[PDB]
Amino acid sequence: PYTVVYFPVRGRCAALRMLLADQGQSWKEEVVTVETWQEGSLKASCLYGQLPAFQDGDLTLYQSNTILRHLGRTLGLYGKDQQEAALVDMVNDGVEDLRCKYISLIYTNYEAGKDDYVKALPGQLKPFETLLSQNQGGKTFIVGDQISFADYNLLDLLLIHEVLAPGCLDAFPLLSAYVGRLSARPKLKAFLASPEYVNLPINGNGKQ
Amino acid sequence: MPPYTVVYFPVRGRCAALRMLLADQGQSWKEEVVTVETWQEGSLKASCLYGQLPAFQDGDLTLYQSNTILRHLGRTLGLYGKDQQEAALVDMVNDGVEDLRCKYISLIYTNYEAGKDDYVKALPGQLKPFETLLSQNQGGKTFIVGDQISFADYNLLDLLLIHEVLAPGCLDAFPLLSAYVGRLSARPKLKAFLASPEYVNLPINGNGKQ
Ligand SMILES: CCCCCCSC[C@H](NC(=O)CC[C@H]([NH3+])C(=O)O)C(=O)NCC(=O)O
Ligand SMILES: CCCCCCSC[C@H](NC(=O)CC[C@H]([NH3+])C(=O)O)C(=O)NCC(=O)O
Numbered sequence: 001p002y003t004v005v006y007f008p009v010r011g012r013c014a015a016l017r018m019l020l021a022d023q024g025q026s027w028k029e030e031v032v033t034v035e036t037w038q039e040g041s042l043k044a045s046c047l048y049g050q051l052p053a054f055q056d057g058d059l060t061l062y063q064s065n066t067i068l069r070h071l072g073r074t075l076g077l078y079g080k081d082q083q084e085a086a087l088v089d090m091v092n093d094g095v096e097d098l099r100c101k102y103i104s105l106i107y108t109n110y111e112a113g114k115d116d117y118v119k120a121l122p123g124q125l126k127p128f129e130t131l132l133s134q135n136q137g138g139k140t141f142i143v144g145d146q147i148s149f150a151d152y153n154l155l156d157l158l159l160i161h162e163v164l165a166p167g168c169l170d171a172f173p174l175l176s177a178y179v180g181r182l183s184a185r186p187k188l189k190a191f192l193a194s195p196e197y198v199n200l201p202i203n204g205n206g207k208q
Numbered sequence: 209m210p211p212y213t214v215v216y217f218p219v220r221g222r223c224a225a226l227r228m229l230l231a232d233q234g235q236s237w238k239e240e241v242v243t244v245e246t247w248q249e250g251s252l253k254a255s256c257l258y259g260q261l262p263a264f265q266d267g268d269l270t271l272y273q274s275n276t277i278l279r280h281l282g283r284t285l286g287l288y289g290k291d292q293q294e295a296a297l298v299d300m301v302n303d304g305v306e307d308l309r310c311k312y313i314s315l316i317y318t319n320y321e322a323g324k325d326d327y328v329k330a331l332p333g334q335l336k337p338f339e340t341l342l343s344q345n346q347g348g349k350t351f352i353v354g355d356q357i358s359f360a361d362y363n364l365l366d367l368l369l370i371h372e373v374l375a376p377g378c379l380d381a382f383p384l385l386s387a388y389v390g391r392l393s394a395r396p397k398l399k400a401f402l403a404s405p406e407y408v409n410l411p412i413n414g415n416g417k418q
Contacts, residue, residue, distance in 0.1 A: 093273035
């Protein structure tokens with residue numbers, strides 16, 4: 001019932017793929033090559049002229065976070081009540097802010113800004129360590145005691161930063177244990193080790 | 209006393225949309241103004257989750273992130289669509305608004321002088337998606353999604369209004385958006401609020417540019 005339309009990279013689709021895989025959902029991948037994209041017709045039919053695009057039956061959605069929220073809403077990964085839902089949103093928005101900075105670094109000035117970015121990293125990750133400490137001592141998920149779409153988004157963000165700055169999580173015990181714990185979930189573990197994930201570049205420009 | 213408290217700098221900025229929402233929905237709220245002096249002192253910043261404002265309090269629930277605040281209000285006040293499908297569409301609209309808002313903010317604080325012309329030239333292409341959304345919903349006669357107002361409407365309204373200040377007449381080429389702004393701006397409570405000193409006398413941005 002699901003179709004994700006995207007370029008052949010993990011990018012902004014990694015988190016939603018992990019979510020679908022971990023939740024045991026099936027989906028079809030519609031790969032869009034740079035050639036096809038530069039042709040122009042697909043772009044013109046996209047609401048904001050960008051991908052990913054997602055189809056749930058006849059519902060066509062755009063915007064990665066909208067897709068995540070939609071899945072969180074339909075699959076029950078949006079907290080147990082309104083208070084938790086608000087907290088889940090707060091976590092996801094924080095993830096999105098840092099993701100934008102990451103994306104900017106990767107595509108705008110990797111060479112020149114990498115050092116400053118890595119130096120500033122600890123300050124950027126602290127908020128998530130704090131959130132974790134306030135939720136049952138970081139023994140469960142980011143919000144509440146059930147997994148939410150924010151968890152998958154945060155997991156991806158942490159994983160790609162471990163590739164960018166190996167060991168950046170060493171100074172954060174809760175985050176470190178969190179990544180290990182989530183990465184150990186049966187279906188997610190199988191997915192993260194599959195060619196489907198491993199053989200796709202993280203970003204489109206060969207930088208990471 | 210009011211259950212809501214918005215903590216922010218004395219500017220409209222990322223709080224304009226939520227204020228319009230509260231006002232239009234007849235809600236009461238307390239404004240906790242943070243001056244640049246107080247902020248540079250450091251203690252408040254250190255207590256903020258991501259080291260930034262706005263901050264929002266609903267009873268003992270302290271929230272950060274403007275869009276989280278909007279979604280929370282949309283969820284508790286019933287401004288999030290009539291069902292899941294609409295909720296997804298509302299999110300899609302809001303995310304689009306957020307993307308353009310970031311570009312606007314970047315222009316305003318990063319290089320207003322140098323980039324203003326290019327930005328205004330690219331504007332029509334950026335607004336088209338919203339005109340399209342409007343055309344697909346009862347011919348743009350009601351709201352952005354469905355037939356009931358959502359938090360996305362307030363966010364979009366603010367975005368359109370601030371762009372009308374940046375590039376006067378930018379909405380002329382978009383009949384649906386133009387009528388939409390006029391229609392929403394005419395709602396009783398919202399109209400009263402937009403004309404109040406509380407709104408009018410607050411600068412749009414913090415650096416005096418708009
Ligand atoms: C080519 C391989 C690298 C691909 C990089 C990732 S896609 C980047 C871009 N899409 C976005 O930035 C999506 C942003 C949107 N806010 C979301 O979160 O979904 C796009 O479609 N860009 C195409 C365009 O704008 O023309
Ligand atoms: C001073 C008058 C001008 C104020 C401009 C608007 S506040 C800007 C900034 N906050 C944000 O950018 C908030 C972004 C956040 N993602 C959201 O959506 O709420 C901040 O708190 N910055 C303070 C800091 O980072 O130290």
